[PDB]
Amino acid sequence: LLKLFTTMELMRWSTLVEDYGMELRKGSLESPATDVFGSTEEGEKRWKDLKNRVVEHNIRIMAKYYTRITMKRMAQLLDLSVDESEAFLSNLVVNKTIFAKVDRLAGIINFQRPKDPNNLLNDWSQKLNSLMSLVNKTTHLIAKEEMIHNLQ
Amino acid sequence: NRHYYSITINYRKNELEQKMLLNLHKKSWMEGLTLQDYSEHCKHNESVVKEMLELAK
Secondary structure, eight states, rough: OOTTTTOOOOOOOOHHHHHHHHHHHHOOOTTHHHHHHHTTHHHHHHHHHHHHHHHHHHHHHTTTTTSSSHHHHHHHTOOOOOOHHHHHHHHTTTTTTOOOBBOSSSSSOOOOOOOTTTTTTHHHHHHHHHHHHHHHHHHHHHHHHHOOOTOO | TTTTOOOOOOOOOOOOHHHHHHHHHHHSSOOSSSSTHHHHHHHHHHHTTTHHHHHHH
16 A cells, blocks of 8 residues: 555566465455455456556656656566557556657657746746745845844 | 814924835835845736737737
8 A cells, every 4th residue: 555655666566476466375364355356357357457557657656757767768677568558658648648748759758848938837937936035035034133143 | 264263284204204104115115125026027027918018009
């Protein structure tokens, strides 16, 4: 649960293989894992849908970051094919990846770098940067000016 | 006005009232560090006032 909680480091599911396997083996707790695999196809749908759901979820986590993990490298670190990464992109176009950048030339993607209107976006960055510099500059200024009063 | 008259009124203002009330009122129309709301409207020239520029046209 805490690994599914937030800020998911891209982790190996082979580490989850022994977790789910002994999660079938032990009858100490959560005995109906064999009931999760109860139907011949349904637990397989839960399983491929499960690996699918986390392998989309972590992409939505690193999609917050603009750090550009360069998905041709990511498909190599994931040890999975880029064709099912195109299938992952078919899950992304219905998962609304619609604000992104792909390449005919490269295979590296960008989740950002919009058209960037300077009357909107660099407007906004310049606004909160300048203003927060001004008023954060304002407060501890007079506050430390009150702190030096107590040394007298 | 019969049986009932009036008297003139003048004032007095010393320089502490003058400059205290004056910088009090200019400061009541100015900002704290005073550089604060400048870039705000400089960049509302890019966000808001462009609409008022088109409506002006």
